[PDB]
Design an enzyme around this catalytic site. Structure first.
Site, PDB file in Angstrom:
ATOM      1  NE  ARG B 101      -4.448  -4.860   5.746  1.00  0.00           N
ATOM      2  CZ  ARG B 101      -5.350  -5.655   5.170  1.00  0.00           C
ATOM      3  NH1 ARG B 101      -6.213  -6.340   5.924  1.00  0.00           N
ATOM      4  NH2 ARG B 101      -5.390  -5.780   3.849  1.00  0.00           N
ATOM      5  CB  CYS B 103      -0.768  -7.115   5.090  1.00  0.00           C
ATOM      6  SG  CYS B 103      -0.877  -8.812   5.475  1.00  0.00           S
TER       7      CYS B 103
END
Ligand code: EMC
Ligand code: EMC
Ligand SMILES: [Hg+2]
Lengths: 124, 124, 124
Positions: B101, B103
């Protein structure tokens, strides 16, 4: 993997390639409104978006891909208020074949471009 | 390759698809807190994040994928100060399976959403 | 498909993995300038960029990939004015091998990092 090089898009000057082919896929670098000779297009957002698409068209075709095989695009724009205008140009290229897409407004782009677009496409 | 279409997530209006399947992979478009009927979800950051996940669940399942097969996600948020709140909801869906991920806080999102998330997943 | 974990990169605290391998491709999470022990290397943009690359090298090697098999990178920088400095360091790692790349200045990165980079690479 193999690097993609075409004189029909601005030259990759520095530590990157215009795009890369790996397995049966093509990844383009993020394209900005530069002409093949390396000058920023100074028209409106639509004219800037058109140059971005001319650049994408060149790298996609040199890689054996096309707008019709694009699977995902990420659009970074300098101002979300110009979404509609960029979308009008975007829609001329991805009208019937419609890739997955993400769009966000960033604080700033390289060369203070108003739009930068990257794509991933299938190489048939 | 196949465009993914589901009535359980907001309709893709314009030149993009809710998601695309290519080879054995699924790419979603970035999902925002809109309900399937097209209205921005009413509520705080957690409620908005939950709607984004309901939207992802819908496109993932229609594509033959699931949260358990997501390999990479990108989370774009309007305010980094709300990271913990978004993360707490995010964690409920990626409880034991944990995708790669990235972010980041962006300047602005479509429809002034507070969060937008895109995923790439394996089609079983 | 499997998660990648190495003690030579900052631990992934939260609902994500340092990286994921799917088919023959490795997807890293975005790496920021944290040392393996979890704290921000203190120093200028050059030191921060080098730490991000140390982190990438660690996750790439644990996954069976290398800087030489990276196909696409996405660079997020806190200040576009620092493009030249970051690019100088970036070029030391992607010397003979030049992946596709996108670069943007977002509004804010985790821990107010000055640079964050994610990569996708081939597992030979
Ligand atoms: C292509 C409009 Hg963000
Ligand atoms: C690696 C310069 Hg954006
Ligand atoms: Hg974030």
């Amino acid at each position: 993997t193999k690097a993609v090089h075409t004189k029909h898009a601005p030259a990759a000057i520095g530590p990157y390639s215009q795009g890369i082919i790996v397995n049966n896929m093509f990844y383009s670098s993020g394209q900005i409104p530069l002409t093949p000779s390396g000058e920023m297009v100074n028209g409106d957002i639509k004219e800037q978006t058109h140059q971005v698409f001319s650049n994408l068209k060149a790298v996609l075709e040199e890689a054996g891909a096309s707008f019709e095989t694009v699977v995902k695009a990420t659009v970074f724009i300098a101002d979300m208020e110009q979404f509609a205008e960029v979308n009008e140009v975007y829609g001329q290229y991805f009208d019937t074949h419609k890739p997955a897409r993400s769009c966000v407004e960033v604080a700033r782009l390289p060369k203070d471009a108003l739009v930068e677009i990257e794509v991933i496409a299938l190489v048939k």
